[PDB]
Each structure stands twice: as structure tokens, then as C-alpha cells.
Amino acid sequence: SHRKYEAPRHGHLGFLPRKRAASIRARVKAFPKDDRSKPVALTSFLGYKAGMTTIVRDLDRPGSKFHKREVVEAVTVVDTPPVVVVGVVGYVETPRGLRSLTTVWAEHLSDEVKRRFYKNWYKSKKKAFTKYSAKYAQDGAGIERELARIKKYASVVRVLVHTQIRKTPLAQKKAHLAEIQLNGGSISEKVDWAREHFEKTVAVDSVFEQNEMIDAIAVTKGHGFEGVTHRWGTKKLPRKTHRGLRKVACIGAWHPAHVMWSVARAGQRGYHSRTSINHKIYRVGKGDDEANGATSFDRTKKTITPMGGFVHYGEIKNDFIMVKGCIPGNRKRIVTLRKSLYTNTSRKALEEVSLKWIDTASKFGKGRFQTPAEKHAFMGTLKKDL
Amino acid sequence: MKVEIDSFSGAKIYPGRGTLFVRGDSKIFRFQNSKSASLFKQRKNPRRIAWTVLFRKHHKKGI
Amino acid sequence: SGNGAQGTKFRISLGLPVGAIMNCADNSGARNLYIIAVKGSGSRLNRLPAASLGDMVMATVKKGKPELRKKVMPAIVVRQAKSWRRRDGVFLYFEDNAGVIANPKGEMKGSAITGPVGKECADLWPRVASNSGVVV
RNA sequence: AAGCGUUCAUAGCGACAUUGCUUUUUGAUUCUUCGAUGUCGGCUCUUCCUAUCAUACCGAAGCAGAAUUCGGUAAGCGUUGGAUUGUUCACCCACUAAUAGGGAACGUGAGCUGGGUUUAGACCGUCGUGAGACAGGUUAGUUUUACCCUACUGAUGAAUGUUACCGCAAUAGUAAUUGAACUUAGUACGAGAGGAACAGUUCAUUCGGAUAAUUGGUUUUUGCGGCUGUCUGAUCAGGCAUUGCCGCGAAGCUACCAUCCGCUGGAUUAUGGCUGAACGCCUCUAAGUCAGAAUCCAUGCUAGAACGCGGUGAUUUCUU
RNA sequence: CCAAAUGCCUCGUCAUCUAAUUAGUGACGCGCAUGAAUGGAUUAACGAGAUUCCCACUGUCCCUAUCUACUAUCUAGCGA
RNA sequence: GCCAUGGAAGUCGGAAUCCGCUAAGGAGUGUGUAACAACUCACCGGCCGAAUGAACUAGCCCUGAAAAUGGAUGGCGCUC
RNA sequence: AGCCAGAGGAAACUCUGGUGGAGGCUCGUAGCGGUUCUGACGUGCAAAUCGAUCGUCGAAUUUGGGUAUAGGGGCGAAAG
């Protein structure tokens, strides 16, 4: 017989299987549609999520009852040192799908990306790309042969970048290598753009800008094996329930004589690839720019790092992106920021954000001071020596 | 920007921080964090809590 | 909430489910308001309809004048005591749970309000704002 | 289709008759099960049907507007909180867009519960000489086992010359939903009473995926402070009180108790059209063809075939 | 004395209790089928008896989160 | 044409439906008008030029034709 | 209960403060039970246990030993 009481399903069937991700760097499964009139730019960037903080700004949207008033919003800051372009991959079109036809690498690879090709770096002879580097030796004719194939064929062109994780307070020592599609220009311009940027960095201000919607692509935070109450949001059973109450009472009817794929069952929670869209950029900050955290309204010569540092990450000494709200994944986690796949004109987009204040009070407690000079002025001179 | 003052501890209240309390006599109170809010709810005297600003001037410390 | 409201209300944290008894803030005669229903409340299995500041509710009178008792009348919540966040980042709350008796059209049955009134309730109900004194 | 519907069979109905469908009623049968298929209801959870309550797009009206009624495609997406009752059923209160009907061994007891029925105790009423009977009422009454196989949820993994990195995408899943308020606009419509809709904006309901700047919750941070009783001769400093207790309490986890985020292209159904014959006229239809739904397929999102595939790096001697 | 632990019809009728009551209480009584030591009516006190309502109180619930110990987990031995 | 209708003069409602002209013209088929009217039809020709209308009869096809795990002319598929 | 002192009153008589320590009284240990969780366990620690919560706790109390009653028999504050 019927349920006797209708209710919506628990959990989303399109986010299955709730299994661990294949890689800790979530892959980009779609790039924006290419219009070849614009110059050759990157379609996404790589970053390390540093943490979250607080802003104040004036809302600019008529109709709202907080129009022209100071609203408080949560932002997340991601550490984005420039990516080093070290390769290019041509993709031919085929009645089975895109297919890499060939790849060309820069003649010099840093050790931070050479480490990516090693499981045991410290024992090896470090032989990676040593014979390939002799293809530029005489005059680089063989390299020019491969680049010409990408120009002739390869209707889709993607570039290879690796992070400068040395300039980051991670213990990792090993950079993250990824493919980023090149939009703008035709195939020849895309190949020429890749060739001219070999061994050269690409700043985040050239691919991103303030007030535009970008998407986050990261693996979420792992939680291990989890029961059905916190994995699917199913009702806890009554207190009187014998042999367990954090369960699903009926896991199926008699017929079909099987457990269904759509029944909530215990398993892995978190560490799933997720792609969240429509994160407005609130600030594109710069590394060699003291007063990162200052705005037009603060003028306090302070960076974006909270007082005492970002908890579990460190200080931000490089450039950064600062998007509204929360993105998937935790601190220290490699995140891919991608430009919007469609043009958003919501009026929640298209609106210019001017920050009025950035929080730098410590996130290691109830931080009550924005800067050490502010703490010194309020609290006075202490017993601790100078 | 409007940086408030703790009604119990004389602390700077930056936007977003702590809790505002409206009493039955319609008197506003502002607490920077739940340490000061809880002490207010327990009816502790701010003049006898050694780290509050009200205590510090009552005993003329750091003059 | 419902009909009679002069505009929209940004979401306030719900703290007053059905079966809650809140104070009566007006001079209509009632001393408490027993919430039986929330106007404009959704349907979810086993979820209690819950009210917030400035919500029209349907309530009975348990303690008060006999002519107001044993009847369902509408009411507007004016104090919440459950902490809630405004869009300027401040988390605030009152001491108690207070409401005023209203009609479905939204105008107030009493002529005065005892105590502070939430700003969200005053903005959404002009007749509560008229009879209110201090607001937050 | 005799009549009803001011006139008017067929807007909406519809007598006298008559043709069916269904297996959510109850009968009827006794084919299976009596070396036992756990038995009512409720809770929990998933999925399916459509005979559609709502929501999308429509057609019709005894459709002026408004609100309704009939009907089409359509099950994509929802269909509630309570008083009484064990109740299925019922009844009322109230919210809501709506509170549609069903199925899945009358779904679901090694998932629960055990209020009922249906052991043994006991009381009443009626019946019986009696022992006792009552699909009459009342009260008390042990709810056992998974570690096997499959299924499902997650997790490894031999073989591919080795190893590493970067990728494609067959297939499978798929998700968003509904309302209010302002404006339109007291406008169209209407004699008035009343009173819309499209576009625009601001919010909200329900669901989902995350996240932890803030706020709240949690506290073996036994971190700090305090308090009781006892022990270490006192002090200092501690032990014990099965985490002694109290207040605060970072980190971590976490809440519609917090915040953020939840895409746009094509092809279509009903229907309305174009051109246009059959039928020298007409006609959305026969050949062609336009628009067009909460539909479908893609864009997008998740997984990645551990017997689908591509590109790229390095590939072992002073080593039987 | 009563729709009672006894009334089928029956969720009897009225009142009260609630927003709403097959429950509770108070009334009515041709009562299928109440009733006088097969004891009737009442009754202070008592009851791990049955039942209803109210205050207090709370994770029973809205709506679930978190912590601890012992398991479960993996390992050595043992081994149904 | 008669009533009747503020108003119906073939077309609310009743009621009749005579012959003079005639190749044809019914006080009437409808659109209709406040009402005639006007227009249209029945009918007639200086205009075409091959069959057409009504009633039915039954072959196949279609509508009637709604169920619950995904599924069954045995399967694939099949349209002179 | 009994007893002592005191107060009021015309008489009957009434009242107060102490003392005393009764009761198949009562709160509650040991003990004796075994209400509820319908908790744990439920191939157990256990063919009836464990934990909390409970009843009773100076007598119709609890209990050792001795003794009597034996199967259509016993014994039963009565449940076959």
C-alpha cells in the first residue's frame, strides 16, 4: 500500500556514487564556449584555498530593503601565485570524442613540477625530461615539427600549467600540474600563445577580474565512513528502537527482492568532486602589495592575512582571489577556479562590489583586534619586554 | 563602519561579532563575545571582573 | 506573513513552533497567546510550523479576559528571544516571546504595545509600527 | 437521449434501458502453504500506476472582470501540522498551491513498536444446574538469531612490458520546486459592486550540494579559574571521588539554530496556425510546414568500462 | 445506582474541558442485559493498580549535533 | 400578410403560407438590424463542362482502450 | 495513652505548655522482594542473569537446622 504520507526524497540522486574522488585535484569537466575573436586567455586558474574572513560593503541593488546600506558577508580567500606554463596539448576531433594528438613541453622544467612525475623523488637520479630537453639542443627543429602538427590539426588547444607551490606555506614541495583550455584566437594564435609563454608565469589578474562570477572545482572535505542519518539526512528512529536508531527502518519492499540503488545506505561522506557556480570575485589582490586588506574606507596599511595568520594555512605572501561565500574543499586544498560557462545577467551579477572593510582579527579564537598596532593602542604597554 | 562597545567589558565590537541583547526595559546591550554575554547573564558586576575596561579605570591601571 | 503584509520580510530564524505560548504585548485583555499555526508556512512531514519575528500567526488565548478566550484569532509576533541575524551582520534577540492580537487584514485589536518591538515587525506591519513605542 | 437547464437533448446534467473496465471493497472458490511464509495498525524508507488535488501549457462554458465548472497533453514536481480513537476507516481544528486516489506478499516485525486481536491471572453483564460460553465490555501479560550467499552501500585489487603524469568519454545516474509582496494598477473588464494578467523587481516555501568568516551548540584542550569531601604534617604543589562539580573555554565537528551556491540550448505533447488537395468550394493534414508544456534529449553536474581508448616522461651492466 | 471495569444500538443526548476530544468529568435513563452479604450506595486514609486534566520540567518531538568509555576495526595467541 | 412586440414588417412567440408576373423569386434558409432594410440561401439564366447526391452493408485501420519492478507476436526486427 | 505544671470560668467544665514514647504508622540502609525501562543479554556471566528504577523494611517479618505431611496423594492468604 501507499506511503500514507507523502514526503520528498532524502539526498540527491544525481550526485552518485557517494564515493571517494579519483584525484585530490578535481578535474575540469567543461570549459566555456570559445569565441575566437577575443585574445588568447586562460579559461581557468589553479589555487590553494587559504581560508575565510568577513567583509562589509554597501549593497547596491534598488528594491531591496538593505539598499545603500552596509551588509556583512562571508568571503573565502584563495592563494593564487602565478602558474608557470610548461606545455601545450593539441586535441583533434573524432567520431568518438576529443583526442590528444601530441604534446610539446618547455625545454626547462623546474624541480617543483619534476617532482610531480616522481613517487620517490629523493632516491631517483632525476632523469625526467632529460632526453626530451635535447630536442631543443641543435636548433629545435623537432619541437617545431610537433607545434606545426598542433597548428594543422587539433581543433581544441589546451595549455599545461603548474603551480609555484614554493611561494606557498604548504609542506607539499610538489606542484600541481593541470590542463587549462585556451580560448580566444584561432588554432594558430593559441599555439603561438602557448609557445611564447613557455617557462613564463601567468598572473591571476590577466585571467580574472573583480565583480565577475567564477566557479570553484575542488574535492570536498573527507569525513570517512558515515551512517545514513548524516550522509542522507534521514529521520532518526524513535528512542524506543531496539537494535539501532541511526538507520533506515525499511530498506525496501518485498518485491523487487533486492535492495534498490536509491535507498539511503551507510558509506563514504565527503572527498567528492564538486563544481559550484556563480561565485562573484570581490577582490583580485596582489602579492607585492602591502595594504591588501585595506580598502578605500579603511586606509589601514594591512594585508589580507588575519592577525596571527590563517589558521592551518599560514600567511598569504602571493596574489589572491577573494570570492563571495563558500567554495567546496577545506584549507590547504588545491582548487580550480573556472570562468562562467554562460553569461549571467541576474542583477546579482553585473553589480560592482566595493569593499568597505576586511576582517583581519584572529581566527584562532575571538580575535578582538585587527592589527598589532590597534592591540597595542587599546591595551597599552605590557610586562613583556620590548 | 560603526565599531560598537561591549556593554560589559568595554571591548571593540567589529561588524559581525558577538550578540546584541534587548532587555525587557528595552535597553540595548552589546557583547563582543559569549564570555562577556554569559557573565552578564549571570549578573556579574563588570567593575569586579579584573579584565573589563570598567574595572581598569576603577582601579586606575595604566594611567 | 500571509495577507495584509506591507511588503516582504527577509528570513528570520524560526523560534516559535506551534504549541508555543508567547506573551501578549497589547492592552486588548489577553495575557498570553498560544500559537496554533503560522501563516504562509510550508508543508513538511513531521515538521512543526514555526513562527518568527513579524509573522502573522493564528493563536488562542489561554490566560486573559474570558471574552477573548476559547477562540482563534490572528496575531503578530513582535518579540522573539531566539537569536537571529540581520543582513548587517548583527545577531540579536529579546528576553521573551511577545505578540499582539490582530485581525486578518493586519490592523491591531489593541491600541498600545508594552515593550520593545522588532524592526522587522514594525516595517512589515504599519499598524504595529503606529502603536509601537520604542523599536529595538 | 425522454427530460432538466428562462427558450435550448447533449455549456453542465440526464430518466427508462444497454456496453464495458478495474482488482485498492465484500462475496464466491479451496489450487499452494498446517515436519509454521510471523497476524492488525502506526512509525521509517524507496519506487511504481494514473482513474490529476496542486503546479506548466492549452481547449470549452449558461467564460464581461473576478471566482468557478467541464475537458486535453502531462505522474516532471509536491500533496502538511494537530484534538479524539489501537484503529484501518471516521470526524473536526488549522495552515497551504494542494492537503488526489492507489500499488509494491492488504510493501516493509532477524527494521522498530506492541495500543488491538489471539494463550495462561482477574472483574462485570447476559446465558448455562454445573464445568463453562460470549466475532460483549475491562485490566495485566518474555517480540529470539545474520558472522553465510545474493542484493545494495562504500573500499582494495592480479593480469595490460614496467613505471609515472596528463587526458578523452561509452555507459549509468541527474534536480530543483512553489508562493507572496511591490509595480503593472484600482488599470483593462464592468452600470456598479468588484477586480485581472504579461514584462520588471524584491523576497519567501520545499528540496539539494557544499562550507565554517560570524552566531549558537558540543568540551578529555581535563586549557584556565573556582568549590566540596578526604589524603599527602602545614605551605607550595598535588592524588582520589569510575570525566567529582561549577563558570569560561580555543581547535575540531556541526545547525534552515549559521552562511553561500543551485545553468541554458535543441527536439516535442495537447493546442492554435500556414500553404494545400482529397471533394472545381472549404479544410492545421493527406504530401509539406510554423509556433508551442513543469515533457524528452542535450549543455551542465557525478562516476568512469577495475576485459573502452589517447598523448607524454623515464625506462636498470661495472648488477650470475 | 448507571452508556459505570456492567448499554447492543453507540462515537447515545446535553453540559463542561480543547482551536479541534470515539478520551475525561458532570447530568439524563423502559437499564440488549444495573440493583441489594450471587451484597447496594457511599466513604477519610492507603495503592510499583486503571484513567483524565493542570503547573513545573525537560532532546518525547520540531531537528538533530557533539563528547567520553567499552565494542565493532586491524594485529599476536586462542578459537566455537 | 395578421396578431404581438417602444420594435419585429420571412428569421421573441403564436400563426398562416392565396396567385399576378414569370427563364427565377419562398410573405422564407440563415447572417442579421432597436426594427425593417441590406446581404445570403431555395430557386432561375447571357459563364464553365465530367459525372454527382442520399441512404445503408462489411473488409482492414483508427477512436472507444486506465495499474501499479523493466519486458516481451518467444527474441531481433519486419511496412508492394 | 499515662503523668507534671499552669491558665480561664459563678457552676458545669474548657484550654495551654511540658513529659512520655504508642502504632500489623511513616522516610530510608542491611535484609526480603521483583514494578518499569516491555533497558542489557538473548548460540548469555546465567536453562531466568545484569544495570538503573522500584515495593517493603520491627512484623500476617526474614532465615538456618531439626521434624511432619507422598502421587488421585500431599500442600495451597487459591495461581491449577
Ligand SMILES: [Mg+2]
Ligand atoms: Mg500517495
Ligand SMILES: [Mg+2]
Ligand atoms: Mg569555503
Ligand SMILES: [Mg+2]
Ligand atoms: Mg576559528
Ligand SMILES: [Mg+2]
Ligand atoms: Mg491521463
Ligand SMILES: [Mg+2]
Ligand atoms: Mg502486509
Ligand SMILES: [Mg+2]
Ligand atoms: Mg522482513
Ligand SMILES: [Mg+2]
Ligand atoms: Mg520481530
Ligand SMILES: [Mg+2]
Ligand atoms: Mg497488548
Ligand SMILES: [Mg+2]
Ligand atoms: Mg548520459
Ligand SMILES: [Mg+2]
Ligand atoms: Mg588548571
Ligand SMILES: [Mg+2]
Ligand atoms: Mg581537593
Ligand SMILES: [Mg+2]
Ligand atoms: Mg588512593
Ligand SMILES: [Mg+2]
Ligand atoms: Mg569506589
Ligand SMILES: [Mg+2]
Ligand atoms: Mg487558409
Ligand SMILES: [Mg+2]
Ligand atoms: Mg563525469
Ligand SMILES: [Mg+2]
Ligand atoms: Mg579506467
